[PDB]
Design an enzyme around this catalytic site. Structure first.
Site, PDB file in Angstrom:
ATOM      1  N   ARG A 212      29.267  41.296  36.596  1.00 41.52           N
ATOM      2  CA  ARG A 212      30.709  41.124  36.439  1.00 41.52           C
ATOM      3  C   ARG A 212      31.463  42.279  37.096  1.00 41.52           C
ATOM      4  O   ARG A 212      32.490  42.069  37.739  1.00 41.52           O
ATOM      5  CB  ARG A 212      31.102  41.049  34.960  1.00 41.52           C
ATOM      6  CG  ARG A 212      30.624  39.804  34.221  1.00 41.52           C
ATOM      7  CD  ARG A 212      31.473  39.576  32.971  1.00 41.52           C
ATOM      8  NE  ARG A 212      30.995  38.465  32.152  1.00 41.52           N
ATOM      9  CZ  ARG A 212      29.898  38.501  31.401  1.00 41.52           C
ATOM     10  NH1 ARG A 212      29.152  39.600  31.358  1.00 41.52           N
ATOM     11  NH2 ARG A 212      29.550  37.438  30.686  1.00 41.52           N
TER      12      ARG A 212
ATOM     13  N   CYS B 159      30.493  44.115  39.616  1.00 45.46           N
ATOM     14  CA  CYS B 159      30.417  43.930  41.061  1.00 45.46           C
ATOM     15  C   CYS B 159      31.280  42.767  41.563  1.00 45.46           C
ATOM     16  O   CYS B 159      31.911  42.871  42.615  1.00 45.46           O
ATOM     17  CB  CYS B 159      28.958  43.730  41.498  1.00 45.46           C
ATOM     18  SG  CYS B 159      27.889  45.204  41.346  1.00 45.46           S
TER      19      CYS B 159
ATOM     20  N   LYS C 180      34.093  41.682  40.427  1.00 41.15           N
ATOM     21  CA  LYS C 180      35.521  41.978  40.372  1.00 41.15           C
ATOM     22  C   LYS C 180      35.933  43.313  40.991  1.00 41.15           C
ATOM     23  O   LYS C 180      37.084  43.732  40.855  1.00 41.15           O
ATOM     24  CB  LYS C 180      35.998  41.920  38.922  1.00 41.15           C
ATOM     25  CG  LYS C 180      35.594  40.635  38.208  1.00 41.15           C
ATOM     26  CD  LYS C 180      36.353  40.457  36.911  1.00 41.15           C
ATOM     27  CE  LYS C 180      37.816  40.161  37.176  1.00 41.15           C
ATOM     28  NZ  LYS C 180      37.974  38.925  37.993  1.00 41.15           N
TER      29      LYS C 180
ATOM     30  N   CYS D 275      37.668  63.335  43.924  1.00 43.38           N
ATOM     31  CA  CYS D 275      38.368  62.209  44.535  1.00 43.38           C
ATOM     32  C   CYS D 275      39.778  62.453  45.077  1.00 43.38           C
ATOM     33  O   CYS D 275      40.243  61.692  45.925  1.00 43.38           O
ATOM     34  CB  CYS D 275      38.399  61.025  43.556  1.00 43.38           C
ATOM     35  SG  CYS D 275      36.831  60.095  43.423  1.00 43.38           S
TER      36      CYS D 275
ATOM     37  N   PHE E 253      31.051  53.600  44.040  1.00 47.38           N
ATOM     38  CA  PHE E 253      30.811  54.682  45.001  1.00 47.38           C
ATOM     39  C   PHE E 253      29.951  54.362  46.219  1.00 47.38           C
ATOM     40  O   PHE E 253      28.872  53.780  46.094  1.00 47.38           O
ATOM     41  CB  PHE E 253      30.204  55.908  44.299  1.00 47.38           C
ATOM     42  CG  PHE E 253      30.940  56.338  43.053  1.00 47.38           C
ATOM     43  CD1 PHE E 253      32.309  56.127  42.917  1.00 47.38           C
ATOM     44  CD2 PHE E 253      30.256  56.978  42.021  1.00 47.38           C
ATOM     45  CE1 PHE E 253      32.987  56.545  41.767  1.00 47.38           C
ATOM     46  CE2 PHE E 253      30.923  57.400  40.871  1.00 47.38           C
ATOM     47  CZ  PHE E 253      32.292  57.182  40.745  1.00 47.38           C
TER      48      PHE E 253
ATOM     49  N   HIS F 107      44.605  56.245  47.368  1.00 46.34           N
ATOM     50  CA  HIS F 107      43.176  56.390  47.104  1.00 46.34           C
ATOM     51  C   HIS F 107      42.702  55.195  46.278  1.00 46.34           C
ATOM     52  O   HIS F 107      43.159  54.987  45.155  1.00 46.34           O
ATOM     53  CB  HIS F 107      42.889  57.692  46.342  1.00 46.34           C
ATOM     54  CG  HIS F 107      41.471  57.806  45.872  1.00 46.34           C
ATOM     55  ND1 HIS F 107      40.402  57.867  46.740  1.00 46.34           N
ATOM     56  CD2 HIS F 107      40.943  57.810  44.625  1.00 46.34           C
ATOM     57  CE1 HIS F 107      39.275  57.903  46.050  1.00 46.34           C
ATOM     58  NE2 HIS F 107      39.576  57.868  44.764  1.00 46.34           N
TER      59      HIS F 107
ATOM     60  N   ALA G 114      41.690  48.003  39.918  1.00 44.76           N
ATOM     61  CA  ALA G 114      42.728  47.976  38.891  1.00 44.76           C
ATOM     62  C   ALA G 114      43.883  48.930  39.193  1.00 44.76           C
ATOM     63  O   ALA G 114      45.042  48.617  38.910  1.00 44.76           O
ATOM     64  CB  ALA G 114      42.128  48.305  37.529  1.00 44.76           C
TER      65      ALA G 114
ATOM     66  N   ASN H 234      34.437  53.024  47.365  1.00 45.22           N
ATOM     67  CA  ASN H 234      35.084  54.304  47.056  1.00 45.22           C
ATOM     68  C   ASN H 234      34.237  55.461  47.592  1.00 45.22           C
ATOM     69  O   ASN H 234      33.211  55.808  46.996  1.00 45.22           O
ATOM     70  CB  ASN H 234      35.242  54.439  45.530  1.00 45.22           C
ATOM     71  CG  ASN H 234      35.902  55.745  45.109  1.00 45.22           C
ATOM     72  OD1 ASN H 234      35.914  56.723  45.857  1.00 45.22           O
ATOM     73  ND2 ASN H 234      36.442  55.771  43.888  1.00 45.22           N
TER      74      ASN H 234
END
Lengths: 380, 388
Positions: B57, B59, B61, B163, B214, B302, B307, B335
């Site tokens: 799930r 992965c 979304k 980040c 990541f 970034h 979300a 990311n």
């Protein structure tokens, strides 16, 4: 009207050290006892000679006899102990740094809400956020203070933070930069080993300490009091020196690999750095400027002095710091600046630089890097 | 000579400008649709049926199509503790980073220098950023050695920032280039997941989401003030920068470098904290410019997760097209920590050129770049585009 007008100036200096004072004369017996090595009698003689030649009288260490008893894995030469060491660092580096910063801010005399930038330097940092975030919280600085963390640069970093502070202050009108160097040997302490010999020299030289500065351009008359002005900076890597000084952060903590050619490499390359910095000013007499040199060890100081035929007095402030505090990595050169200006004021000289006009500050470290910072003194 | 005369002849004149951009990724491409089966097999966790459903799930979304990873099945098979959730494995991870971070960073740097067109000997400063560095000297030293830059290049390493560091390196490059006449700054962000990869745990779902997001990558830039007309070619100009810590967010994003490598722990809802603090960051940066309509500026955000993008878009009522460049990078690379925003700058300028826009910023004049990360930090960089 965003950029500043004048040279980045040091407006205050404050220092701090752990309360535990360790006399050098009796460290050999202590060290080999706490590490259950009193039986290697011979190896203790090698360490004995290293301490006798170190020219250090005392050091200050976070690590006490009790804390070492609390951590046997740290007392062995190579045992899993990083996690235990990180916990110590997470607390002590920011605490010691805060103590020094508070004194610098007190000397400065301005509201801490006026600090616009923050540079924090330490050989290592345990988490994310880095130590810069932790210090911002402990000092109660503005949440929108602009931060920069300088980690794993090493012994030459005292020059590095000055190099960074210079550009941040000069390119931003009204900018006031708090600079903090905090070094703690909890990350490097370990037992003796007749195999890994070069690791032994660090146990005889490294000590704990922190120093803080307030740096800014266009000082406010009377409200702020300049100490030293920065003029020019540079950084370079000495030829044929790869591996001269290496460090590895591993599960057993931080280990160093420094050979014996270090003194030779530093002194042989010091002339080029000086010419690059002073020829543009027409200065050729190196006894006519004031000196600040990272006391990585006594040999480095002896050869630089011999090589350039400097009068013994030139290295005084540098040697005084090595004697009373030992090698505190990045913090050393900042402690030396403080010693020089205080001593100069004490003896009634005419400038913060032992009565002279121009000066030079050198940082030495890994990747055999040499950091150079040209300075100018301030009247009385 | 006096210090005044020295300072006057030492400073640069104009604003820092990005003159070239280059990127690189490991050769191993990993498809997201089938990653769940691959990840649970290599970590020998196929008996955790329910946990695997949750990961599928995550992965599905993530809005990520694929990622590039230095870590391969062959490497993982040689390092058994790297496959466990929390076992002694830092020393092995350090050796991997010592080679890959500098190698990948050099690959991107070579591409940026080629576009720039000038001698590597004219690079005066070097900024290298990575979530972590294994030794002393830091990765900045190794890059200098691999590229063969002058030994007197002035270096600065940015480690364990995280980040948000894509904004951090731009903020630093801005001052180094603007305060020194003739300065040309090479900026490199290189991130490799070998330091964070680990097995699944049903009591650490926050760690698991990281395994779905990541990816690896490096981006390089050449930054300088006073570009040589018709010889050097400006892409974006920097105007103003800021960094701040969001209120009540301590613990939202935290990492720990330990014997088992680098781990992360969350507290509260990151997407909510970002979207609730984004408007204030924008008003403070664009109020002075007299801009209140955020659909009138180009965007670079970034992509920490899908979300964050959805909530930002909804909070400011942005048209779908605003996040085109950002979502393309998240979709094609995942990311990549600090490197993301730099890949996005490259995508935006290439697409603007490709589709015939009048400026490198999708035909608009002003733009904004945001970096989000640990100690809930928000880095803001205001930008101005270049004609055509």
């Amino acid at each position: 009207a965003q950029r500043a007008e004048g040279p980045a100036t040091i407006l205050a200096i404050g220092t701090a050290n752990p309360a535990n004072c360790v006399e050098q004369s009796t460290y050999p017996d202590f060290y080999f006892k706490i590490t259950n090595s009193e039986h290697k009698t011979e190896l203790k003689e090698k360490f004995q000679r290293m301490c006798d030649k170190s020219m250090i009288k005392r050091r200050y260490m976070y690590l006490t006899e009790e804390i070492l008893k609390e951590n046997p894995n740290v007392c062995e030469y190579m045992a899993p102990s990083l996690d235990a060491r990180q916990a110590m660092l997470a607390m002590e580096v920011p605490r010691l740094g805060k103590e020094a910063a508070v004194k610098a801010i007190k000397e400065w005399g301005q509201p801490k809400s006026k600090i616009t930038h923050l540079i924090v330097c330490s050989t290592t940092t345990p988490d994310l956020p880095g130590a810069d975030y932790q210090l911002t919280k402990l000092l109660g600085l503005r949440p929108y203070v602009k931060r920069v963390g300088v980690f794993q640069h090493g012994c030459f970093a005292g020059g590095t933070v000055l190099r960074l502070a210079k550009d941040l202050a000069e390119n931003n009108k009204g900018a006031r930069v708090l600079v903090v160097c905090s070094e703690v040997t909890a990350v490097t302490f370990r037992g003796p080993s007749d195999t890994h010999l070069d690791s032994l020299v660090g146990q005889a030289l490294f000590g704990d300490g922190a120093a803080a500065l307030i740096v800014g351009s266009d000082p406010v008359p009377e409200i702020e009091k300049p100490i030293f002005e920065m003029v020019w900076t540079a950084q370079t890597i000495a030829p044929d020196s790869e591996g001269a000084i290496d460090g590895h952060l591993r599960e057993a903590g931080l280990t160093f690999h420094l050979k014996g050619a270090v003194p030779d490499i530093v002194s042989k390359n010091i002339t080029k750095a000086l010419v690059e910095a002073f020829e543009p000013l027409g200065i050729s007499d190196y006894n006519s400027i004031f000196w600040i040199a990272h006391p990585g060890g006594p040999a480095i100081l002896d050869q630089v002095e011999q090589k350039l035929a400097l009068k013994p007095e030139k290295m005084n402030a540098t040697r005084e710091v090595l004697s009373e505090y030992g090698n505190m990595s990045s913090a050393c050169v900042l402690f030396i600046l403080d010693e020089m200006r205080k001593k100069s004021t004490q003896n009634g000289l005419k400038t913060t630089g032992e009565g002279l006009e121009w000066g030079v500050l050198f940082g030495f470290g890994p990747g055999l890097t040499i950091e150079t910072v040209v300075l100018r003194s301030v009247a009385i």
